[PDB]
Amino acid sequence: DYKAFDPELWNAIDAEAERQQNNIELIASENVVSKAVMAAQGTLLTNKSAEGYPGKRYYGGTAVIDVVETLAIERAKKLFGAKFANVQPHSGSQANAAVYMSLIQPGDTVMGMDLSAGGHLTHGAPVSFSGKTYNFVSYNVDKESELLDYDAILAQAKEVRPKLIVAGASAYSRIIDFAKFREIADAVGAYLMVDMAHIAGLVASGHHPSPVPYAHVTTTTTHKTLRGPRGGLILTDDEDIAKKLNSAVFPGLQGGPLEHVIAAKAVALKEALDPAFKEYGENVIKNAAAMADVFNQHPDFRVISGGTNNHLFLVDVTKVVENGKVAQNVLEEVNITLNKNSIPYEQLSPFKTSGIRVGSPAITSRGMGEAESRQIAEWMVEALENHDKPEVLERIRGDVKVLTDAFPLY
Amino acid sequence: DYKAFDPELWNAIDAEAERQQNNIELIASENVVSKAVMAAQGTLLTNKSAEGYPGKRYYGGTAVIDVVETLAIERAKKLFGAKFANVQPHSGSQANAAVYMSLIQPGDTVMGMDLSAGGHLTHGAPVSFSGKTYNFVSYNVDKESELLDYDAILAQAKEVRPKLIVAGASAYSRIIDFAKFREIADAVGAYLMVDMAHIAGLVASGHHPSPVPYAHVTTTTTHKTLRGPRGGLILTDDEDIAKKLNSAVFPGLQGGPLEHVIAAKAVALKEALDPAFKEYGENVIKNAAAMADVFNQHPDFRVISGGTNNHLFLVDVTKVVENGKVAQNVLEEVNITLNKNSIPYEQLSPFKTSGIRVGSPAITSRGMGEAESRQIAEWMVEALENHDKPEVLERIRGDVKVLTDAFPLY
Ligand SMILES: C[C@H](O)[C@@H](N)C(=O)O
Ligand SMILES: C[C@H](O)[C@@H](N)C(=O)O
């Protein structure tokens, strides 16, 4: 029917479905959404423009849109224990931009986690609007432990006097002490924003402490560990802040929201409020720990910080291949996607890096367990140690295909 | 059976589908997308992170995503005749922000169409990031003709000396001369950006002159007259601006793109390349002109500029009801949604306005013709003359149901 009209597009979508089936996805930001989240996004709510907020719309015909957006807001509030939520940001970048716009002025100093240790692009990369508009100053982990050192972060905050401190990371494997971050913010009179995008599903699942009681404002993506549609979310307990956030999102940065994506956010948040989501989060944690253990045991690989207590970890591969870029290329030859990744105090260039980052959420959402996870990391050790032996990669490829065959994506 | 898990969300979606069926949508921005466009947005492409651009991605496993985005880009180029396209902006607001980031600096002077005569929020409203970051000075239409006066705009531009002139409007009913806008820009050394979001479908259908050969950069939404999914699009013929635009969208303003929405853009652009789309645009123009004609003939109503040559028009309602806010609330009683709208040189407050805006794209997409269009406008005239009279509104609401029943939405 509708696909006969555009075979080039619809065939490419079948190819991507098959590609996702035959791939072992370890990119730590990826997940596998439910059928219901996809269907929500494919509905006729896309036809209706909803500029404004529930009960305060520009346009009539919005009573039902209002029920759907209210459901998203109420479920975010319930799941994360916050008194206000805004479900309109189109992305995590828009969510973060709305928060800077609400709490600080162009030119103010912001402290964020060093891009080599886990900081996101929107936490002050010079190539980001973040870096261009505000004065970002980065904090790092300790050189020797590779852990956050809250005394060192406090001593830097006293020198730099930020207006806003950002906590959260895309490559930190350990539990963040949000209460200490709020104590640091308090000691220098800064706001604390936490970007929980990478860990939000473990926060919902109960496996990572919540930032919501400690941060002035919490942002997140609805995708990644929370396993929702791609989009943003902002949370706060402060009603004056909530009103600034609302105006910064619309009409400050966006026009009307994507109400079909907001319906998919409502669906994903009810999935996360279900008891099975806690089990999901336990398996994320155990799968990641099983893979990190293979690299820990092995003499030629070091895990940054020695391990993980979340969904991901970094590995210094440089004793085995030249750089993380090479490691990423080799593993792509066996149907395993991950990303090269700077390690703390990274010596090589950003385009090479000394490391890979590995995450467990996608394989976990396909039903894989600890045994599979250990096996995948054993395959990665093999392929990297044998990168210039085409015979070997070929056999690992065939092994990988038996595994993917056994854990159907959908 | 996913709906049985969340009946509250899925019941709300069935309610909006029914509400859309029973509504006569005349909000000039709205449309009714195809089933193919909705289906595309509901695919597993949401799972795949595609930071970067085709062949230049942060991550592997992206070869097929590259085919999908390349199709969108190529179809946009071909539909609009542009040498470069970027299909990743999440909205029209992010498209425009990326253009301003690429062409000018914070604090520079920008001329845009006055917000009472049709300039968009992102062309300088003080509540927008646009208005807060840049110095916007507006041009207007001539007071007597309500037409753009290109001589008067040149004289103003010579005084103001903007770095950037923005053309495009959300409420201007007549054909814009983009060649003259570019001659004005060239005469004062400004860039020209055209936001063609409202008219993009008419540009595509052949019914409105293309800005693409004249603007340095053209932005649009993919929704509205173009009848695609919600999102943005940028076009340019200058390779050096293309490069700056690409960096501005990512990583300047956004993270990774919504690839499932990009597939839906590819779908909508192929629909618009088809000969049937020219017939759609013809109907859009005739339907709008039939509804304007009812208000033109009637003595108590005045159409701004005396009529229309696009998808929309404005009506000064103030001889019949107090303000356009009242007119919007009255017509919602009879299942007709439109929006109040400032008219040029508006005397009332922006919360009330002297006018309504009416557009044809949505009713046109449901198959209505000139006879139905004229009938709907006669109903609006009756409802507004009888706004006081609940039993008249009741009768009109029954008549609207007969017509909506006869023109099924999907
Ligand atoms: C902005 C966006 O949501 C980003 N965090 C990403 O995953 O692409
Ligand atoms: C930013 C956005 O796309 C605006 N033009 C709208 O339709 O909502």
Mapping DSSP onto H, E and C, the string for chain A reads CCCCCCHHHHHHHHHHHHHHHCCEECCCCCCCCCHHHHHHHCCHHHHCCCCEECCEECCCCCHHHHHHHHHHHHHHHHHHCCCEEECCCCCHHHHHHHHHHHHCCCCCEEEEECCCCCCCHHHCCCCCHHHHHCEEEEECCCCCCCCCCHHHHHHHHHHHCCCEEEECCCCCCCCCCHHHHHHHHHHHCCEEEEECHHHHHHHHHCCCCCCCCCCCEEEEECCCCCCCCCCEEEEECCHHHHHHHHHHHHHHHCCCCCHHHHHHHHHHHHHHHCHHHHHHHHHHHHHHHHHHHHHHHCCCCEEHHHCCCCCEEEEECCCCCCCHHHHHHHHHCCCEECEEECCCCCCCCCCCCCEEEEECHHHHHCCCCHHHHHHHHHHHHHHHHCCCCHHHHHHHHHHHHHHHHHCCCC
Closest CB to B16 among A44, A122, A230: A44
Method used experimentally: X-ray
Which residue in B295, B300, B353 sits closest to B325, CA to CA? Answer: B353
> Mutation test of ligand 2: which of B90, B120, B221, B258 has the most ligand atoms closer than 8 Å to its C-beta?
B221
Question: Which letter does DSSP use for residue B193 in this model?
Answer: E
Query: Around B17, how many Cα atoms within 13 Å sit in the side-chain half-sphere?
Result: 14
Show binding-site residues of B: 115, 119-121, 239, 349-351
Which residue in A341, A318, A343 sits closest to A29, CA to CA? Answer: A341
CB atoms closer than 10 angstroms to residue A4: 7
d(CA A254, CA B129): 9
Identify the residues whose C-beta falls under 6 Å from ligand 1.
A 29, 91-93, 197, 221; B 49, 254-256
Cis before A251? omega within 30: yes
List CB contacts (< 8 A) between A36 and chain B: 2-3, 5-6
d(CA B163, CA B137): 11
The burial class, CB within 10 Å (0-12 / 13-18 / 19+), for A239 is exposed
Whether residue B270 and residue A230 make contact (CB cut-off 8 A), yes or no, is no
Q: Which long-range contacts (CB under 8 A, 24 or more apart) does B124-133 make?
A: B124/B166, B125/A251, B127/A247, B127/A251, B127/A252, B128/A251, B128/A252, B129/A101, B129/A252, B129/A253, B129/B93, B129/B97, B130/B96, B130/B97, B130/B100, B132/A252, B133/B100, B133/B106, B133/B107
In this structure, the residue with its CA closest to atom 4 of ligand 1 is: B255
H or E element that contains B183 = helix B178-188
Pairing of strands A84-86, A109-113: unpaired
Show binding-site residues of A for (6S)-5,6,7,8-tetrahydrofolate: 115, 119-121, 239, 349-351
Which residue in A293, A287, A314, A286 sits closest to A172, CA to CA? Answer: A314
Task: Tell me how far the alpha carbon of residue B337 is from its chain's centroid.
Answer: 16
Question: Which letter does DSSP use for residue B321 in this model?
Answer: S
Using alpha carbons only, what angle is made at residue A208 by residues A206 and A213, rounded to the nearest 5 degrees? 90
CB atoms closer than 10 angstroms to residue B18: 12
Radius of gyration of chain A measured on its C-alpha atoms: 22
d(CA A160, CA A151): 14
- Proximal ligand: closest to the CA of A258: 2
The burial class, CB within 10 Å (0-12 / 13-18 / 19+), for A282 is middle
Closest CB to B39 among A40, A42, A409: A42
Whether residue B33 and residue A46 make contact (CB cut-off 8 A), yes or no, is yes
| Single-letter amino acid code for the residue at A394 | E
CA distances to A198, A385, B53, B90 from B87, in Å: 26, 40, 10, 9
List CB contacts (< 8 A) between A122 and chain B: 255
Whether residue A67 and residue B125 make contact (CB cut-off 8 A), yes or no, is no
Estimate the crossing angle of helix B239-247 against helix B92-103, to 10 degrees: 120
Interface contacts A/B by beta carbons within 8 Å: 229
- Proximal ligand: closest to the CA of B88: 1
d(CA B61, CA B50): 9
- What are the helix (H) ranges across B189-323? 200-205, 239-247, 259-273, 275-297
In total, chain B counts a number of residues equal to: 410
CB A66 within 8 A of CB A57: yes
Whether residue A44 and residue B38 make contact (CB cut-off 8 A), yes or no, is yes
**Mutation to test the B interface, candidates A26, A46, A365, most B Cβ within 10 Å:** A46
Estimate the crossing angle of helix B275-297 against helix B259-273, to 10 degrees: 80
Closest CB to B61 among A23, A71, A329: A23
| Single-letter amino acid code for the residue at A388 | D
CB B314 within 8 A of CB B354: no
List CB contacts (< 8 A) between A47 and chain B: 20, 30-33, 362
d(CA A14, CA B343): 49
> Mutation test of ligand 2: which of B29, B99, B100 has the most ligand atoms closer than 8 Å to its C-beta?
B29
Whether residue B16 and residue A230 make contact (CB cut-off 8 A), yes or no, is no
**Mutation to test the A interface, candidates B3, B9, B18, B259, most A Cβ within 10 Å:** B9
Pairing of strands A164-167, A109-113: parallel
Compute, in angstroms, the gap from residue A254 CA to the centroid of ligand 2: 7
| Single-letter amino acid code for the residue at A293 | D
Compute, in angstroms, the gap from residue A350 CA to the centroid of ligand 2: 36
Whether residue A13 and residue B92 make contact (CB cut-off 8 A), yes or no, is no
CB A374 within 8 A of CB A363: no
CB B107 within 8 A of CB B134: yes
In the block, tokens 């005394």 appear at: A151
Identify the residues whose C-beta falls under 6 Å from ligand 2.
A 254-256; B 29, 91-93, 197, 221
CB A120 within 8 A of CB A168: yes
d(CA A231, CA A330): 32
| Domains of chain B by start residue, with CATH | 7-30+276-405 (3.90.1150.10), 37-273 (3.40.640.10)
Compute, in angstroms, the gap from residue A163 CA to the centroid of ligand 1: 24
Burial A96-133, CB ≥16 within 10 A → b, else e: bbbbbbbbbeeebbbbbbbbbbbbbbbbbbeebbbbeb
Closest CB to A328 among B30, B60, B362: B60
Whether residue A27 and residue B59 make contact (CB cut-off 8 A), yes or no, is yes
Whether residue B27 and residue A9 make contact (CB cut-off 8 A), yes or no, is no
Coil, strand or helix at B263: helix
Burial B344-378, CB ≥16 within 10 A → b, else e: bebebeeeebbbbbbbbbbbbbbebeeebbebbbb
Closest CB to B251 among A33, A127, A409: A127
d(CA A32, CA A365): 6
Closest CB to A129 among B44, B61, B253: B253
Which residue in B266, B249, B235, B246 sits closest to B84, CA to CA? Answer: B235
In the block, tokens 């209505």 appear at: B368
Whether residue B6 and residue A36 make contact (CB cut-off 8 A), yes or no, is yes
Cis before A275? omega within 30: no
In the block, tokens 């501005």 appear at: B248
Which residue in A227, A225, A196 sits closest to A211, CA to CA? Answer: A196
Q: Which long-range contacts (CB under 8 A, 24 or more apart) does A294-297 make?
A: A294/A374, A294/A377, A294/A378, A294/A380, A294/A381, A295/A377, A295/A381
Residue B197 CA, closest ligand 2 atom number: 5
CA distances to A2, A85, A222, A365, B407 from A38, in Å: 18, 22, 13, 15, 29
- Proximal ligand: closest to the CA of A226: 1
> Mutation test of ligand 2: which of A254, A260, A262 has the most ligand atoms closer than 8 Å to its C-beta?
A254
Number of H helices, E strands in chain B: 15, 15
The distance of A376 to chain B (nearest Cα, Å) reads 17
List CB contacts (< 8 A) between B6 and chain A: 36, 266-267, 270
d(CA A34, CA A226): 11
d(CA A80, CA A77): 5
CB B177 within 8 A of CB B150: yes
| Torsion angle in degrees (nearest 10) through CA of A143, A147, A150, A153 | 40
CB A92 within 8 A of CB A219: yes
d(CA A384, CA A330): 7
Question: Which letter does DSSP use for residue B163 in this model?
Answer: S
Show binding-site residues of B for (6S)-5,6,7,8-tetrahydrofolate: 115, 119-121, 239, 349-351
Whether residue A67 and residue B101 make contact (CB cut-off 8 A), yes or no, is no
Whether residue B44 and residue A255 make contact (CB cut-off 8 A), yes or no, is no
**Mutation to test the B interface, candidates A8, A14, A16, most B Cβ within 10 Å:** A16
B345 in the Ramachandran plot: left (φ > 0), alpha (ψ -120 to 50) or beta? left
